Design a binder for this molecule. Sequence first.
Ligand code: HEM
Ligand code: HEM
Lengths: 219, 214
Amino acid sequence: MADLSELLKEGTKEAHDRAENTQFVKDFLKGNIKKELFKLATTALYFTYSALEEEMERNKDHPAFAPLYFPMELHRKEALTKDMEYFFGENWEEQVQAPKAAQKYVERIHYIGQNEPELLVAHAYTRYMGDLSGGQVLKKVAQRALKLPSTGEGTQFYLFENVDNAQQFKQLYRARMNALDLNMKTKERIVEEANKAFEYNMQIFNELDQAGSTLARET
Amino acid sequence: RMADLSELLKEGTKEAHDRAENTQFVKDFLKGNIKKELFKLATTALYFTYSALEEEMERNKDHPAFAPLYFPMELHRKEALTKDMEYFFGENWEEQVQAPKAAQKYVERIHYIGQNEPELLVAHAYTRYMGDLSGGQVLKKVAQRALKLPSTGEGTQFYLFENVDNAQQFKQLYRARMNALDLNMKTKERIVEEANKAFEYNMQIFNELDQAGS
Ligand code: HEM
Ligand code: HEM
């Protein structure tokens, strides 16, 4: 009956609103986030996106994912690697681990990309559609809050230097999702997997929240 | 010999097994960090999962695509699990207990496969029992040490195969029977995919049990 993009928008309303209501997000938007906590979040992002982009690369020619493959426009790994150099140093990859909640999310991404790639759209939609929407605001907030350089270092993740217009690209992306040949069953499963994706993001946030509480006991 | 189902399953589920080996709950279990109540939840998930699995194997016991793999006496865990449930919860353990959300999904899938695609039931037996026969002894000793359980086996009877004299040899018998099934290459590949699903159902139970850990 309805488009996948609408099924997704409507089917993830509840989960999207709970994501806005998380303590970590409220403290972020209002500008009260501290360096070492931003570093854990950036780390969470790096491992998340590394897996996601590895799995999209795997399925770049899969008819159930091919139209959503935008390496040059959307991919965040390169940017996040630059952000990890700035915060952690030169040999960061040798020493940093993926936080537990991020590791769970990563595990799920690898499963989906390797075994049920028709559901990978759910993880791409959840992640990239959000990035394009709020990217400009969060970049400005974090820079001012942490006294970061205006030239961009430390926030490369939030800048899409190959998207000329975010709104127009979102429109493009929705139309590509809707063109995918899918049963009503597979569509329902995709919506269910996006809600799972949000729940993984929730776990990540409240991990950071409780990591911030142990950050406050020390300081 | 790489066309043999047992090879196809081992090569085909390698990535999934690596994931299972390194997941947070499994690592925390092996270190001895899992406590009594969380072990009671873990066992609960096992009970419902194996009830479903052993019901569907009982149903398909005569099906040509599964029959040789029917081992109620050697493999079935339901009776062992029941005794473990009794030991931790007491006599009225049934009314004390409910299946965790992720276990329900696993159970629902087992029933579907057993009722609608019986040719893929081997994928579920493979994933569960072959794992059980490989690590049970270690898991048992870990559980006993962490929870101060008796050496006589109370609470860990799930991990002991009383009617299997040699796990290693029995696994080889099982592999040989899997390879003996009259199956085309298309069905074999569908078995490998379901086996990967099976692993992920376990991943979700592990992931939920870790959440309960907090
Ligand atoms: C930091 C708090 C957040 C705020 C204030 C926020 C705000 C917004 C806004 C204003 C939109 C525009 C709706 C539109 O596209 O017309 C949007 C879209 C979206 N957001 Fe968020 N967001 C937040 C966090 C998140 C998180 C954590 C996720 C999950 C990864 C997420 C996922 C999405 C998705 C998938 C869309 C596109 C929906 C669609 O148009 O189909 N957002 N967000
Ligand atoms: C630290 C955790 C684990 C370790 C160290 C471990 C170890 C092993 C090892 C060494 C084998 C090889 C036995 C052989 O080929 O003779 C094996 C077999 C197997 N394991 Fe695991 N295991 C773990 C967890 C799991 C889990 C969670 C599952 C899924 C529920 C699983 C499923 C299997 C299966 C299906 C086999 C048979 C492979 C085959 O021979 O085809 N294992 N395990």
